[PDB]
Amino acid sequence: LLRILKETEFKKIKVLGSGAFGTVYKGLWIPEGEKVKIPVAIKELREATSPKANKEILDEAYVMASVDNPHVCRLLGICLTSTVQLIMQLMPFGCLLDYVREHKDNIGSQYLLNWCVQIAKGMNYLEDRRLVHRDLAARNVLVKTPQHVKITDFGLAKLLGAEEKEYHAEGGKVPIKWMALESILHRIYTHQSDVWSYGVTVWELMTFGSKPYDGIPASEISSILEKGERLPQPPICTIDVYMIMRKCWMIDADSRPKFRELIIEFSKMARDPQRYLVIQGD
């Protein structure tokens, strides 16, 4: 169901950001035969070197165009010229990581707990679609409004077949500081490995954008996890919230809570935000 867009249908206004993948522009999309102006993000990728790389781009686009959930960022279309341009709905505030870093003073406990609910709802939706994200992190959650965030970036996602519960990677593409231990040791990725990355993502939100295992090299993360050491308790978290993060980091993947449980646990805490998160001027 991939919608193909022509160059005349959209126009680039200004640059939003960039990366090794390419450049993202703030754009305006006018569908062919219409007059409505839709604000869009235009992700113009670098030229692919290999046909394998070109398929990986298209595979990511098919996945991103197929997800339909209020807390998952969908692909609106694709334009093929000298390069590949991916058109998505504009998220005006950007990634949740930079948002919590640049608004640390103005973020309440209700906002942090609601984000945990929304991210856990989107992941639970992806789990029902038999998708393993494999790259969940605060840098890959986009902020439509401060009350509404969405999961994006399916460049590492994998679809599970009829009777398979795991994905066996052929290499290392995920940042190790978000990887579950079984992924570090056996390249196994499951929904419960996404729960590990979810607990890291929550830790990023509760520390207002700190780097996990800051100053520790990537080659020594496995050594840390083998000794039983985890991410420290953020100063704003009560014992209830922090133990939820610790269960996401248990060695037995089935001992970790599932996303559908995290929805109820964080919805309960969102009803009394100041009971579970103590912020200075909340």
Ligand X SMILES: *CCC(=O)Nc1cc(-c2c(-c3ccc(N4CCN(C)CC4)cc3)[nH]c3nccc(Cl)c23)ccc1C
Pick the stretch among 83-91, 168-176, 222-230, 241-249 that binds ligand X (CB under 6 A).
83-91
Closest-CA residue to 208 (of 56, 115, 100): 100
The structure tokens 């305006």 sit at 28
Is 136 a binder of ligand X (CB under 6 A)?
Answer: no
Closest-CA residue to 257 (of 214, 210, 211, 202): 202
Is 142 a binder of ligand X (CB under 6 A)?
Answer: yes
Among 67, 90, 107, 188, the residue binding ligand X under the rule CB under 6 A is 90
Nearest to ligand X by Cβ — which residue? 95
Q: Is 135 a catalytic residue?
A: yes
> Which residues in the 10-69 window bind ligand X by CB under 6 A?
16-17, 19, 24, 41
- Catalytically annotated residue among 105, 135, 214, 272: 135
Nearer to ligand X, 139 or 256 (CB): 139
SS3 state of residue 91: coil
Q: Tell me how many residues contact ligand X (CB under 6 A).
A: 16
Pick the stretch among 86-94, 162-170, 212-220, 242-250 that binds ligand X (CB under 6 A).
86-94
Nearer to ligand X, 95 or 174 (CB): 95
Please state, in angstroms and rounded to a whole number, the distance separating the CA atoms of residues 244 and 143.
24
Count CB neighbours of 199 within 10 A: 25
Is 98 a binder of ligand X (CB under 6 A)?
Answer: yes
DSSP output for 208-235:
TSPPTTTT--GGGHHHHHHTT--PPPPT
Is 107 a binder of ligand X (CB under 6 A)?
Answer: no
Residues 6 or more apart in contact with residue 222 via CB below 8 angstroms:
176, 181, 184, 185
Is 175 a binder of ligand X (CB under 6 A)?
Answer: no
Among 64, 67, 72, 95, the residue binding ligand X under the rule CB under 6 A is 95
DSSP output for 165-218:
--EE-SS--S-GGG--HHHHHH-EE-HHHHHHHHHHHHHHHHTTSPPTTTT--G
Secondary structure letter of residue 271 according to DSSP: T
Among 139, 158, 191, 256, the residue binding ligand X under the rule CB under 6 A is 139
Among 42, 75, 88, 117, the residue binding ligand X under the rule CB under 6 A is 88
Q: Cα–Cα distances in Å, from 169 out to 27, 228, 258?
A: 36, 25, 22
Query: In the complex, what is the shortest distance from the CB of residue 137 to ligand X, in angstroms, rounded to a whole number?
Result: 9
Residues known to be catalytic? 135
Please report, as ranges, the residues that interact with ligand X according to CB under 6 A.
Answer: 16-17, 19, 24, 41, 88, 90-95, 97-98, 139, 142
